[PDB]
């Protein structure tokens, strides 16, 4: 009737990665993108399952940001709005500081927030960033899905347009696709010796050739 802000677990007859097989007992559909895929049984322990879910979420978000920052500047260079973009050679460019001191500064700045996130995972609610306004009531967020004023300034979560489970599976699926994409780009940059969009262009033309088997 209103907006439900709780994740709804998928029914036990949900579509699976391998239809006709029995989904594992530790995957009951309560997690985003739950398709019953665990051949090695790595998620048997619920605590390790929570840690692996958070790790998958983090890898998903970093991979989506990574693939966006590879593809969009590469699509701009092919269009012509970037003079000398190359994501493989981007790390060896000349900046205002050495890579080592930039790495140390990045380590400190990122280990602040990664460690605040660690404290939130260990103790939910120990660190709160959303303001405690005098009569506004802050809803309790899920671990790994925070966000009031800063991380969720759109209020697109918490049951708004698509239910929280639907948007979370969408995020997880795009993240898995981006992880596979980034690993593919990393292998293509050292195998083909070319860019991503160039490789796509030579694969779309005569796809019977210009493949993994022709370098």
């Amino acid at each position: 009737g209103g907006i439900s802000s709780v994740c709804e677990p998928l029914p036990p007859d949900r579509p699976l990665w391998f239809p006709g097989s029995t989904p594992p007992q530790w995957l009951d559909g309560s997690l985003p993108g739950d398709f019953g895929f665990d051949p090695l049984g790595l998620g048997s322990d619920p605590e390790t399952l929570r840690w692996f879910a958070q790790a998958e979420l983090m890898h998903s978000r970093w991979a989506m940001l990574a693939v966006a920052g590879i593809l969009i500047p590469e699509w701009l260079e092919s269009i012509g709005l970037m003079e000398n973009f190359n994501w493989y050679d981007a790390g060896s460019r000349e900046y205002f500081a050495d890579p080592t001191t930039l790495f140390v500064v990045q380590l400190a700045l990122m280990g602040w927030v990664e460690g605040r996130r660690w404290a939130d995972y260990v103790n939910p609610g120990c660190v709160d960033i959303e303001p405690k306004l005098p009569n506004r009531k802050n809803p309790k967020p899920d671990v790994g899905y925070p966000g009031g004023l800063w991380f969720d300034f759109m209020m697109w979560g918490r049951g708004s347009p698509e239910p929280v489970m639907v948007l979370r599976t969408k995020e997880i699926k795009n993240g898995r696709l981006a992880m596979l994409a980034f690993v593919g780009l990393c292998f293509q940059a050292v195998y083909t010796g070319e860019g991503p969009l160039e490789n796509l262009s030579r694969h779309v033309a005569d796809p019977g050739h210009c493949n993994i088997f022709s370098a």
Binding site: L133, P134, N135, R136, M155
Partner: peptide, 30 residues
């Protein structure tokens, strides 16, 4: 007469609960 009977000099003419109230305060927007 201000419940001080002694002031009865007019002596003639010249011719609501159940609503219930709660504490409401404005708060910051979304």
């Amino acid at each position: 007469l201000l419940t001080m009977n002694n002031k009865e000099r007019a002596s003639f003419f010249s011719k609501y609960f159940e609503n219930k109230n709660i504490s409401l305060y404005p708060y910051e927007s979304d």
